[PDB]
Assembly symmetry: D3
Homo-oligomer: 163 residues x 6
């Protein structure tokens, strides 16, 4: 019922790609990218929920452009869907070319968080609303992802129990 | 048409959960788990392809049970589906209780890799087959995941194109 | 400095949670980790502003004002507060972000100086800088005294170097 | 006698690729990084065998047999090759794995000693160990001489400590 | 109670590995400053004989670029001792082992406060120089201390202004 | 041509932080071994006046467990100089600043080979002790070196057995 804009809890992270973050080929390790994604996303989720949160799942990570040593990265995270106690966080990862001022989308990720109280049970969260067109796009496309995620949870119980 | 068992390229990783891998709650940071997952899965994909690989996508990571400091983790990675040039890798993450000989499934992840030749174009990979019941389960359930992953890639393209315009 | 940029144009952010690895024995953030992050974010702001590769000439100061504990959420904000011919003062604010009551407290404050370099590695001219809001105004207005101070300190350092060189 | 465990039962694996951060300037793996990974995998194997918390008593040796380059894929295999009353010798084999030609070469070899501890921090009896194949048999058969040298080295180490306490 | 600058003098020899560098094959500054902070904290603990906290980094001057595979020697000592506070100076040298050379690659000044168990400021011993370089750092300390006190005052003004 | 054990002696003071510890608040053995390798490699380079490679870790003895917040002092020196090879001994002490005490927490012996530009074995200067402790490591070194060479034979047998 109480609502927050997607911008209210929007978090940023600017990082330079150092040799330690890459492979022998000068390409950023996917694991490192995902670690950063998880960090920034968790912070956005805490901001939105105004509470501690736990990562329920990584719903996807798409690697669109290779990231090279010395690149400057901008991570942008915001909530695109608010369930009863849960939040979908969308993270955009862009390559920032400072010499000719271009921004290129290098990766895209969706994660799901659950808000938890002192006691550790699911806490209700505020809803969310977009204010500009990009925000509007992620918001409008949230339902498809939520449906698909539910089906995939079904399949996961089948698999876990088989094991 | 050349084939490999899921066992042939199966890779293991045993790690203990140390304070540096944890958050304020003593729980393992999700990012660290995902980094290790990516690492072990890439190696499995290389073994199978007998070639260099690139991560196309993380199809999912399900966090099923929380992991505490001092837990012993076993990551198992194997190929569950082999397309023409692509591989689905499944990673099981288990908590190994050595005091009570149990393994409990703590996380489950699916990633997609593309094999590349020296020039960097997509390379054909061998097909894959299961030998035991668990391998059989992951192998049999792979097609559903592949169909859904294709639909999701279509929508992802829609989103990318939209951000390109806007 | 005739071409100009606002302090906002090159403003960089960094949101990070304080994990055990970032701490020391006392649950406090190690100063070194803080300074490493500060260096990274400031270097990026300087690159954005200069539109060129940069080198860190000096860390002019880091003031630790409020202790930072594990589980705190930090927000690093970096921006250019002064632009010489080829050099830039970057100011970094480090705030403790309380998400439970939506407050911010300034935990640390840092000033660094960068030089822009062209492909030869020679000093490159940079755009000047101007403030748009009151905080930006504060740092911009107080920058000249810090710059004067940095220029004196450059001399003192060259000397410590020669004195140690002879002996 | 006592309960026994096969060398295979507590066998632990670790597959890791050699990335720039794990390297020295030469593009060769840093010895320290290798020893860290070795110690890590070895402790887990020892824990599995003892079914208890363990402490590292000593690294008995690390032999660097083949240089390791960036992009090499390593397989660490760890197993208990000797079990004393409360102690375990763990042997770690480090192999370079070549996917292109499907061959394995022994790049390093290490022997460590662990002591099992119960909740009190007292030495706990551990199960004995037995081999099932030729490789396991080899490390098992060659264990006594190594255990002997570790013991002598414990003696002289005592000598060194006592000498240094005096001076 | 007094101590010489040498009594608490600490050393640290470290090699510059790829993980410590930037894209330029040059040492990442942040890493340098982390090492500086660490060794300085140790020297401060030895002088104070107590727990310390970093009050400020007063300066870090990057004088020569540092490369991968270079060997660094960090030297830290107390150059000024106030009532409860200590200035630590850190010299960072590139140690050329092929022909016994030392080149000063970086120079840093940090200020620490000693804290007793209550977490309150603890009195520390004063300090005295014994050789020419120790004397140099000692004698030139007052300018740095005055600078530090003024800068703390201005930091308080900034905190006040940012609060509103 | 000769060098004293002190000439190439290297120091390292480091504090034990949570990230360097296992679950019991105790320092991870692996981290210790990494630091030992680093400092020993530097000492070997100074003595040899050349690039070096680690041939073997001859031993690491953990004598005292190391806890969070402890200050460690690593001391490395050459205790033996062969034709092209060097034994380096590393002492790891716990530095108590409250009681001006040093307790030996760990002890390690390593072997290095000096390499020329192309990576062929290079002759190194010999080594000599000047005080009693240096003399002790020097005098006890030959027995350890014989042990190392023998262990190379045993390793040779093991590698060849694995080849079949």
């Amino acid at each position: 019922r109480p609502m927050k804009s997607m911008s209210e809890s929007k978090c940023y992270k600017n990082r330079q790609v150092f040799p330690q973050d890459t492979n022998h080929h000068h390409t950023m390790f996917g694991g490192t990218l995902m670690a950063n994604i998880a960090e920034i996303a968790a912070i956005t989720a805490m901001k939105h929920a105004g509470a501690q949160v736990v990562t329920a799942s990584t719903d996807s990570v798409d690697f669109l452009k290779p990231i090279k040593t010395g690149d400057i990265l901008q991570y942008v995270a915001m909530v695109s869907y608010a369930g009863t106690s849960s939040m979908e966080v969308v993270v955009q990862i862009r390559i920032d070319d400072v010499f000719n001022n271009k921004h290129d989308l290098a990766a895209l990720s969706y994660l799901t968080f659950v808000a938890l109280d002192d006691e550790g049970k699911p806490k209700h969260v505020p809803g969310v609303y977009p204010e500009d067109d990009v925000e509007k796009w992620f918001y409008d496309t949230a339902p498809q992802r939520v449906e698909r995620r539910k089906a995939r949870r079904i399949e996961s119980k089948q698999t876990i129990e088989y094991l």
